[PDB]
Amino acid sequence: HSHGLFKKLGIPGPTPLPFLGNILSYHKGFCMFDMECHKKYGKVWGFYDGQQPVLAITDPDMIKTVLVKECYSVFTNRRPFGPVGFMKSAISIAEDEEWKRLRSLLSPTFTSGKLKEMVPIIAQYGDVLVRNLRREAETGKPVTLKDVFGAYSMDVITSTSFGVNIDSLNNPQDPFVENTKKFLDPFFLSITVFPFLIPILEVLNICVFPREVTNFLRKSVKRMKESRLEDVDFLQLMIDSQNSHKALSDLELVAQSIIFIFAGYETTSSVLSFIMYELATHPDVQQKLQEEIDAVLPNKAPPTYDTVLQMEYLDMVVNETLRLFPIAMRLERVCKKDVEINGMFIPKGVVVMIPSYALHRDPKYWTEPEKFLPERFSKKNKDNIDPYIYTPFGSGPRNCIGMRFALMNMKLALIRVLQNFSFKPCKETQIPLKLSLGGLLQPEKPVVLKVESR
Amino acid sequence: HSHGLFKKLGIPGPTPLPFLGNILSYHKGFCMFDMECHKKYGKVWGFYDGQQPVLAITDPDMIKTVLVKECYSVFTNRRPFGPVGFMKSAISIAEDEEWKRLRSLLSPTFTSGKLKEMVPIIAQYGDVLVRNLRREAETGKPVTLKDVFGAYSMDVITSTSFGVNIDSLNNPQDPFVENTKKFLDPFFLSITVFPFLIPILEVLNICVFPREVTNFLRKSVKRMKESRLEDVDFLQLMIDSQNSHKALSDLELVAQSIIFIFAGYETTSSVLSFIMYELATHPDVQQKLQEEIDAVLPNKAPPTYDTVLQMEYLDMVVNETLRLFPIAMRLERVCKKDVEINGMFIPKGVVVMIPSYALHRDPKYWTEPEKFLPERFSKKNKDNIDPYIYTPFGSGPRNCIGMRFALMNMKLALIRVLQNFSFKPCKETQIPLKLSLGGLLQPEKPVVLKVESR
Ligand code: HEM
Numbered sequence: 001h002s003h004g005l006f007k008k009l010g011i012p013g014p015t016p017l018p019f020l021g022n023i024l025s026y027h028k029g030f031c032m033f034d035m036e037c038h039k040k041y042g043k044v045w046g047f048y049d050g051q052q053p054v055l056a057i058t059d060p061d062m063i064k065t066v067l068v069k070e071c072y073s074v075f076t077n078r079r080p081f082g083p084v085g086f087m088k089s090a091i092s093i094a095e096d097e098e099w100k101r102l103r104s105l106l107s108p109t110f111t112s113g114k115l116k117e118m119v120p121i122i123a124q125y126g127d128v129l130v131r132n133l134r135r136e137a138e139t140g141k142p143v144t145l146k147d148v149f150g151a152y153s154m155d156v157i158t159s160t161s162f163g164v165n166i167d168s169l170n171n172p173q174d175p176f177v178e179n180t181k182k183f184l185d186p187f188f189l190s191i192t193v194f195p196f197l198i199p200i201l202e203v204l205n206i207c208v209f210p211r212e213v214t215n216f217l218r219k220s221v222k223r224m225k226e227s228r229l230e231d232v233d234f235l236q237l238m239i240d241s242q243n244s245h246k247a248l249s250d251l252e253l254v255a256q257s258i259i260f261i262f263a264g265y266e267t268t269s270s271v272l273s274f275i276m277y278e279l280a281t282h283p284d285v286q287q288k289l290q291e292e293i294d295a296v297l298p299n300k301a302p303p304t305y306d307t308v309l310q311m312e313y314l315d316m317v318v319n320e321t322l323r324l325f326p327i328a329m330r331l332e333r334v335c336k337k338d339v340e341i342n343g344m345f346i347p348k349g350v351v352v353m354i355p356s357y358a359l360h361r362d363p364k365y366w367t368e369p370e371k372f373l374p375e376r377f378s379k380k381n382k383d384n385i386d387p388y389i390y391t392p393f394g395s396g397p398r399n400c401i402g403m404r405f406a407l408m409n410m411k412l413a414l415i416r417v418l419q420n421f422s423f424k425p426c427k428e429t430q431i432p433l434k435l436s437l438g439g440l441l442q443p444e445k446p447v448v449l450k451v452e453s454r
Numbered sequence: 455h456s457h458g459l460f461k462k463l464g465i466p467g468p469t470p471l472p473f474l475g476n477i478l479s480y481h482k483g484f485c486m487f488d489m490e491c492h493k494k495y496g497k498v499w500g501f502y503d504g505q506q507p508v509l510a511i512t513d514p515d516m517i518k519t520v521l522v523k524e525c526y527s528v529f530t531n532r533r534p535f536g537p538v539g540f541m542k543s544a545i546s547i548a549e550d551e552e553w554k555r556l557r558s559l560l561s562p563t564f565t566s567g568k569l570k571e572m573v574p575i576i577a578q579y580g581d582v583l584v585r586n587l588r589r590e591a592e593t594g595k596p597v598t599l600k601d602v603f604g605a606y607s608m609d610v611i612t613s614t615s616f617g618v619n620i621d622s623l624n625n626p627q628d629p630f631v632e633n634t635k636k637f638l639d640p641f642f643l644s645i646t647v648f649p650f651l652i653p654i655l656e657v658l659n660i661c662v663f664p665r666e667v668t669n670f671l672r673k674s675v676k677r678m679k680e681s682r683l684e685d686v687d688f689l690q691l692m693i694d695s696q697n698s699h700k701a702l703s704d705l706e707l708v709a710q711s712i713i714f715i716f717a718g719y720e721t722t723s724s725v726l727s728f729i730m731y732e733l734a735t736h737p738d739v740q741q742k743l744q745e746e747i748d749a750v751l752p753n754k755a756p757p758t759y760d761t762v763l764q765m766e767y768l769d770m771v772v773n774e775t776l777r778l779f780p781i782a783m784r785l786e787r788v789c790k791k792d793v794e795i796n797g798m799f800i801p802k803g804v805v806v807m808i809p810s811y812a813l814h815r816d817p818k819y820w821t822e823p824e825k826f827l828p829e830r831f832s833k834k835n836k837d838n839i840d841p842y843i844y845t846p847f848g849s850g851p852r853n854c855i856g857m858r859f860a861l862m863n864m865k866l867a868l869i870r871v872l873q874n875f876s877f878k879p880c881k882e883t884q885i886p887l888k889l890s891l892g893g894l895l896q897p898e899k900p901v902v903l904k905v906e907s908r
């Protein structure tokens with residue numbers, strides 16, 4: 001009933017089958033399909049997620065108009081997502097004057113001042129990591145990064161948000177550790193063909209987040225809420241905040257606590273895994289980086305907030321990895337008005353998509369796009385890089401509110417880990433890595449590596 | 455479109471509201487509503503579960519026609535239940551010539567011969583129970599029965615079916631113990647008003663059993679299948695069985711393994727909890743029973759299969775409890791034909807229901823129906839009891855296939871428990887017990903009791 005939309009505006013794309021759209025083209029994952037499309041169709045193309053049209057753009061100025069310029073006016077919300085139940089009040093899912101109300105009420109939690117106030121705490125679990133690694137290093141036993149990294153990222157989230165202190169790797173059976181550790185699978189494809197069936201599940205209290213984990217943290221939060229009240233973390237600042245322009249409700253407060261936890265668990269863990277792979281497969285880079293760390297932190301000195309930003313080959317290494325594996329893959333915004341941006345009409349209701357993964361591997365802005373070369377981000381060459389071709393944290397008012405915290409969380413782990421250990425591939429280590437043909441930005445085979453002690 | 459069905463046949467009942475039916479009358483639970491209806495309307499009445507008519511019968515001969523006589527011809531299947539995914543092949547859910555095919559292929563597992571072959575095994579975990587109770591008995595700390603009883607019933611199921619041996623109470627964090635321990639809640643009411651929405655969830659692979667626990671046991675079973683093949687329990691006999699009239703498939707085999715596990719976990723545990731309450735609130739009965747046990751098993755002798763059936767005050771105690779709390783509450787069968795049984799027309803499609811709980815408390819067949827008096831089942835008075843008024847295990851071809859195993863499982867626990875401990879109520883012990891106004895036959899407040907050692 002709408003599969004003729006791009007044929008009308010003269011916008012190219014693959015031919016959508018009825019009802020399915022082009023979702024059968026996802027057999028190789030969003031990334032390979034975007035790379036193919038960006039290659040076949042050029043600067044702008046179109047396709048249909050079921051009955052839903054999606055438009056892809058690759059011009060730095062047009063992306064800037066959508067993410068930055070016309071964010072408030074036109075492109076304010078991401079693609080609708082459901083069923084969710086009470087999770088409607090979550091920021092990344094919120095919309096319009098209820099997003100602007102929440103993005104404000106929670107921005108003060110990622111300031112340089114508060115972020116520096118978390119340096120003594122995040123550092124405490126970088127140490128706990130070393131013991132868990134050294135126990136498996138002295139017992140030569142190849143190591144799965146995501147396991148031990150997940151336990152660390154888990155340990156940092158909990159502390160930085162609620163104060164609950166657990167050695168999740170050695171307490172994988174703690175009642176607070178279990179609950180926590182929990183788009184092309186059989187369900188979500190049925191959602192994109194049956195978006196008319198989402199409202200059924202919403203009057204059903206059925207949620208893609210199980211109704212159990214949430215109810216454990218609706219109460220675990222209100223336990224801690226009444227445990228510090230009255231008697232430095234994310235929640236101590238979210239309680240200080242409810243003390244535009246209505247204050248923060250309490251089921252509203254329980255919702256954002258959850259979104260941070262995923263945000264910083266599988267992403268802090270996944271990215272650190274993509275990094276230790278690149279170091280293990282480019283040991284020269286691992287050499288140059290351990291030299292820089294011990295030059296800023298001699299005698300294995302403890303990283304501080306001001307020493308972390310001081311490490312430049314560290315930032316270069318982090319950036320280049322994110323180019324190769326930008327965990328979001330795509331950036332998306334929903335167009336709320338008949339608007340003509342940068343000389344092109346965008347009708348109301350169209351999802352606007354930026355293919356981040358494909359753009360990070362576009363040879364027109366990247367020489368040797370699939371090799372690992374941190375030298376792209378040296379202060380020498382870091383200036384020929386369009387800020388709208390490279391967006392691992394998005395851009396504009398709706399970008400990643402936790403970016404500063406993520407770059408600080410990961411670099412405090414890399415300093416403390418690379419001060420002590422070094423990483424060599426295994427025989428059973430997948431060289432080279434194959435990306436998941438599925439729906440998340442993750443490896444086909446989990447990253448296994450040999451670990452030795454300095 | 456069908457709410458005029460009972461008005462037509464001249465059958466009385468509460469007035470159904472559009473779409474909801476009489477389900478708003480479930481605010482006091484199925485039990486209180488059936489008692490009320492049986493009291494207001496007499497021997498036969500009618501009501502609507504949404505758009506679905508249900509007919510209640512209370513005559514011994516008419517129940518016998520449905521459960522026993524015309525089971526094969528007319529009343530073969532229970533009320534349709536979904537969504538379920540692959541669990542369609544489960545016996546209690548199976549229908550017609552695929553139930554008759556499965557009820558046969560699995561009946562040989564509850565014979566007196568095989569049941570006696572499980573006596574040495576089930577006895578091993580009655581002992582493990584004592585230590586866990588004595589640890590909390592020597593530390594005077596009131597005891598929650600369902601916790602420790604659940605761990606025991608759990609320990610017996612696993613062993614009697616797969617051989618996996620765990621102290622689930624002290625291993626509540628065993629990867630095999632966790633998966634296992636998992637009708638008027640917000641969901642199932644939406645199902646009975648929206649039965650047209652079930653087929654949506656079936657093409658969605660959404661199942662009221664989470665798609666996770668099942669996939670752990672589709673593989674855990676096929677681990678054990680290829681671990682004994684090649685190298686006494688339920689599965690060793692289900693593999694021996696696939697060695698009417700097609701053999702047992704392997705996803706067919708994974709399904710029945712699950713249905714036994716619930717069947718014998720929350721029911722073996724719940725019933726033993728309703729029993730220890732009745733003993734604690736009628737200590738004279740507890741006195742008479744410990745005398746009988748030590749008279750059959752002197753010196754705290756180990757129960758055997760032939761000593762267990764020998765205990766008559768034990769059976770009396772078990773029976774009378776089940777009268778007071780018959781965990782099924784109702785028996786149901788779906789009518790597949792225009793039939794006129796015992797002088798009454800039953801049109802096609804009508805669910806036929808027997809109110810077991812209400813009938814167990816009907817003063818016309820029970821003197822002092824709400825008191826606890828095991829003497830109703832003494833060999834003296836046990837003959838004035840209609841086998842179709844008292845059906846804790848159902849009746850006829852479709853009755854509880856595991857009845858013999860349940861009466862043997864529980865009595866082996868009561869002998870070993872009452873040989874050693876005695877049970878007194880607490881202050882915080884709920885005297886008298888309030889039944890759950892909800893959907894399962896369970897207490898409002900979990901049973902807590904003081905435990906002392908002989
Ligand atoms: C390697 C680490 C991370 C990366 C690469 C990353 C990337 C992104 C990206 C690309 C977006 C979408 C931005 C857009 O649409 O323009 C986003 C959104 C978001 N991120 Fe992250 N993220 C990371 C870690 C975190 C962490 C640790 C948090 C902790 C709270 C967090 C919280 C959020 C939130 C709340 C949003 C939604 C913002 C909004 O809609 O206003 N992220 N992130």
Ligand code: HEM
Pocket residue numbers: 521545546547557713714715717718721722725776780781782785786845846847848849850851852853854855856857859860861
């Ligand atoms: C206190 C213990 C138990 C009680 C009171 C009980 C009661 C019942 C009742 C009333 C029914 C329905 C019968 C009917 O519709 O006429 C039933 C069915 C069933 N029970 Fe139990 N049960 C118990 C324990 C068990 C156990 C331990 C198992 C182990 C496998 C089991 C397996 C089954 C099965 C498979 C069915 C369905 C039979 C069929 O549809 O063919 N039950 N039970």
Ligand SMILES: CC(C)(C)OC(=O)N[C@H](CSC[C@H](Cc1ccccc1)C(=O)NCCCc1cccnc1)Cc1ccccc1
Pocket residue numbers: 078079080081090092093182183209259262263267327328332400
């Ligand atoms: C794809 C379509 C168009 C159908 O729907 C969307 O696009 N929905 C996206 C994600 S759905 C739900 C998600 C939270 C969640 C998902 C699964 C298990 C547990 C929690 C969310 O609510 N928020 C995600 C925030 C966590 C995060 C991830 C990466 C970086 N930083 C933070 C929304 C999204 C937000 C941010 C980046 C990328 C996507």
Ligand SMILES: CC(C)(C)OC(=O)N[C@H](CSC[C@H](Cc1ccccc1)C(=O)NCCCc1cccnc1)Cc1ccccc1
Pocket residue numbers: 532533534535544546547636637663713716717721781782786854
């Ligand atoms: C009420 C309407 C009319 C809508 O649906 C039905 O009546 N569905 C009944 C039960 S639903 C699913 C159930 C299994 C199950 C349920 C919940 C969590 C885990 C597993 C089953 O599949 N089987 C139950 C067998 C276990 C058992 C319980 C008690 C005694 N022995 C064995 C089916 C039923 C079977 C047997 C007795 C009472 C009810």
